[PDB]
Amino acid sequence: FEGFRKLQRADGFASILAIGTANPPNAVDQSTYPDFYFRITGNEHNTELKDKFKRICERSAIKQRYMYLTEEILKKNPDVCAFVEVPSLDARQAMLAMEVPRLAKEAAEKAIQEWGQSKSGITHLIFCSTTTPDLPGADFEVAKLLGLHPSVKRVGVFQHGCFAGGTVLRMAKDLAENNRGARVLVICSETTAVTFRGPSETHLDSLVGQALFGDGASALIVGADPIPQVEKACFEIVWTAQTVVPNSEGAIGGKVREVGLTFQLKGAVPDLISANIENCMVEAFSQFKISDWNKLFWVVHPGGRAILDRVEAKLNLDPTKLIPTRHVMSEYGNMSSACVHFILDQTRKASLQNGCSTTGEGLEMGVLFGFGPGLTIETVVLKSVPI
Amino acid sequence: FEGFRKLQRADGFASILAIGTANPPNAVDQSTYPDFYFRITGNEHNTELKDKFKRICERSAIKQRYMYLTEEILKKNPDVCAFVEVPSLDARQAMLAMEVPRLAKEAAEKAIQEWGQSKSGITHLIFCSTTTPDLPGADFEVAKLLGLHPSVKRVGVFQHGCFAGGTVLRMAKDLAENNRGARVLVICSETTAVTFRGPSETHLDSLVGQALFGDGASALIVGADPIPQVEKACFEIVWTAQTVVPNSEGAIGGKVREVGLTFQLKGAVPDLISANIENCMVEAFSQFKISDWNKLFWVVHPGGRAILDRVEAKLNLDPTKLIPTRHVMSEYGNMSSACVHFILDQTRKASLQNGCSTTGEGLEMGVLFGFGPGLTIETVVLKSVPI
Numbered sequence A, B: 001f002e003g004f005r006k007l008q009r010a011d012g013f014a015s016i017l018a019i020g021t022a023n024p025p026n027a028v029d030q031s032t033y034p035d036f037y038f039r040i041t042g043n044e045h046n047t048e049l050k051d052k053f054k055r056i057c058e059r060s061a062i063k064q065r066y067m068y069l070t071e072e073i074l075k076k077n078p079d080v081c082a083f084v085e086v087p088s089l090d091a092r093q094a095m096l097a098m099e100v101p102r103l104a105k106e107a108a109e110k111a112i113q114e115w116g117q118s119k120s121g122i123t124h125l126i127f128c129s130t131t132t133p134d135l136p137g138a139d140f141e142v143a144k145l146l147g148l149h150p151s152v153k154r155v156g157v158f159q160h161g162c163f164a165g166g167t168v169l170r171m172a173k174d175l176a177e178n179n180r181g182a183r184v185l186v187i188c189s190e191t192t193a194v195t196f197r198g199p200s201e202t203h204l205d206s207l208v209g210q211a212l213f214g215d216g217a218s219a220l221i222v223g224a225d226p227i228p229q230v231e232k233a234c235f236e237i238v239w240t241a242q243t244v245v246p247n248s249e250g251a252i253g254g255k256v257r258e259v260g261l262t263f264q265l266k267g268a269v270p271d272l273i274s275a276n277i278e279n280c281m282v283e284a285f286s287q288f289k290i291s292d293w294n295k296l297f298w299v300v301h302p303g304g305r306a307i308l309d310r311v312e313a314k315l316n317l318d319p320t321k322l323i324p325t326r327h328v329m330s331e332y333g334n335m336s337s338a339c340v341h342f343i344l345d346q347t348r349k350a351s352l353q354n355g356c357s358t359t360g361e362g363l364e365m366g367v368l369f370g371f372g373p374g375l376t377i378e379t380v381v382l383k384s385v386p387i
C-alpha cells in the first residue's frame, strides 16, 4: 500500500490550465438603472428613496452589469418585484433551475475549448452557486448538460457566498494534487434572480445589493503535472487559508425564506476587512520571505468600491495593483464567487498583451482574496507562469 | 517550491481516528407511529391511506427512530403538519437553524473526546446536512458552538443528500492526505424537521419517506500519519469513486420550496441500485485482486429494507455481512448521510468486543456505499486496523 499511496497522488502544484467566463446577454447600464429599477418595481413616485439609490449607484464604480432578469421577465413575475409583502421563492427556484446551469455550461464549454482536451478526461467537478433549488444540486445538472462521464466525482458548494471563488480554488488544490492525472472542472455560477427584489426604506442594505450584484459564471480546469507542450498553465495554487473575523457574523448574511433569498450588509464591512487583511498577508507570505506587498500581483473580490479603497490604503498598494480588479467590477459588478476568476482571466490576458514576463504582470507571486458571510476571508497564494 | 510541496503534504493514508454520534432525545416507536402520524396530521378518516402506511411501517425493518419533532412542537406548528395547503418553510428554517448545529455539536464533542487531543489541533471542518437555512451555512455555526479556531478551513456540503456520508469521506481523504498535520472534523447532521409533513393520496411517492426518515448526527476525526501510541486509527480511506446510474434522475429527489423540502422516492430504486452495484465492486476491487465479495466487511447506506435485500441477493453476500447495517436501520431508521458513519462505529466496536483480529470483523478490506439523488452511488474502499 505504501507504493499505492505514492502512485495514487499527483507530483507537482495544482495549476489552472484554462479559464472561461460567461454572462447573460443583457447589459444593464448603471447610469440609467435607478429610473428603470424604480419604474419596474412600481416605486416611481418615491423620489427620496430613488435618490438614495441614485447616490449608491453613482458611487459604486460599476458602469454596467449583465442580468438574466429583463423587463419582460419581471413583468411576468410581479412577485419578484415586491419587497417581502408576498412570497416569491418558488418562482425564483424555477428561474435558478434553468439559468444557473445554463451560464455554468457556457463558461465551462469555453474553458474546455481553451484546455483543448476531450471532456472524457475530466475526473472531478467542483460547482458553486449561492443557492441551488433541488436535490440533485446544480452540480448534477451541469455535468449532465456538459455530457460528462457518469463517473465524474462531484462536489457542490452552496450557500457559502461571495468568498467561494477562493473556496473552490482551495478545494481544487487538494483534489488535483492528491490524485494523479486528475483534471478538475471548477465552476462558479451566480445570478440575481435569487436576490432581486423591490426597494424598502427600512432595509437600505438590501438597496445597496440591488445596485452592486450582477450575473456571471466562471469555469476553470485545474490539474497538477500539466502535459508538456499539450496543456498550458497560467497560475499555480501554492497555499491557501480561510479565517473568520471575530464578532462580525451579522456583517454579511443571507436567509433562504418564502420570499426568496434576503440579505443584510453592514457599513462596517470595509473597516472589518481592512483591519484584518495585513495579518492574512503576513501569515501567507512570511514563509516566502516576502514583506513588500507591491512585489505581488493582486486579485481581490470586488465586494464594493469602499472595500477596495480601504484595502489599497491600508496596505499601501500602488495605484496599479487593483487595476484588473476594478476593471472587472466596472464591467460586471459584483458577481459573487465568480468575480475573482474573471479578474484572474483579465490579469493573464493583460500580461500577455502588454508583453509581460509572466502571467502575473511580470511578477512571480500573487494573492487572491475572497470575502463574504462570516465575515469570512479566503486567502489564496498564487504563482504566475513565465511567458 | 519542490521541497515545499513535499513538506506541505502528508505521508500516509487518511485515517479515521475517532467516531462520535448523537440523536434527539425523543425515541419514536415504529409500532405505534401510524396511529400517531395520522392523528397529528388529521388524516384519521383516510382509512385506505392509513392502511397502506401501516403496512409500510410494519415491513420497514425499523423498530424506532429519534425525532426532534415531538407532539408538543408539532402542536405549536400546525403548518408543518399539513401537506402543501399552506407555507411552512420559514418555520422549518427556524427549527433547522437550532437543531442541526445542536446535534452536530453533540456528536462532535464525543468524537473529540475519543480522539483525546486538543480541538486547537483541528485544521479543517467538512460539514454536511440535507439543507441549511442561511448564509453563513451551518458549518459556521457549528464551528462557533465548538469553539474552533477562526482559521479552521470549512467546507459545507448541502443538498447532496443520502449519499453524502460517502461524499464527506471522499473529501476528507484528499484534505487529510494533501496537508501535513491536518486533522479534519467531519460532521453529518440530519433532522426530519425539514421533511416531515402530512400524507397524501396524490403523492404516494412521498409516503414511504415518512416511515423511514429519522434524525441523527455523526462526527469523525480524519487525519493522515497518526501519532504512535497517542492517536488510534480504526480505518484507512484507501480509494473512492462516485457514479450516476443511467436515466434515473427522478428516482430519488427533493425540492426546496415554500412548503418546505418535498421529496420523492420511486419504487424502482432497489432494482436500479442492485443492477449497478456489481460494476461498482469490480471497478473498486479488481486493482486489489479481490473478486470474492464475502472476503470484505460491509457498510451500506440503509435507504430501505428492499435495497439491502436486493444488494445482498445480487452479490450473494453471506447473512452476516449486512448485520451492522441492518442493526443501525433497526435502531435509528434512515438518518440520511449520517447512517454509514453510525454503521462504521458499530462495526469497529463489535469487532473489538467479539474478539476479531481487525476493526473490520477480522477482515482486511471493506466497502462503504452511499446512495442518493442522481441516482448517485458513492463507493469508498476501506482498510481495517489490526486489533
Ligand SMILES: O=C(O)C(=O)Cc1c[nH]c2ccccc12
Residues within 6 Å of the ligand: A130, A161, A162, A163, A195, A213, A252, A253, A254, A261, A262, A263, A264, A302, A303, A304, A334, A336, A371, A372, A373, B135
Ligand atoms: O460581496 C459580498 O461579500 C457579498 O456577500 C454580497 C452578496 C452577493 N450575493 C449575496 C447573497 C446573499 C448575501 C450576500 C450576497
Ligand SMILES: O=C(O)C(=O)Cc1c[nH]c2ccccc12
Residues within 6 Å of the ligand: A135, B130, B161, B162, B163, B195, B213, B252, B253, B254, B261, B262, B263, B264, B302, B303, B304, B334, B336, B371, B372, B373
Ligand atoms: O435514502 C435515500 O436515498 C434518500 O435520499 C432519502 C432522503 C432522506 N432525506 C431526504 C430529503 C430529500 C430527498 C431524499 C431524502
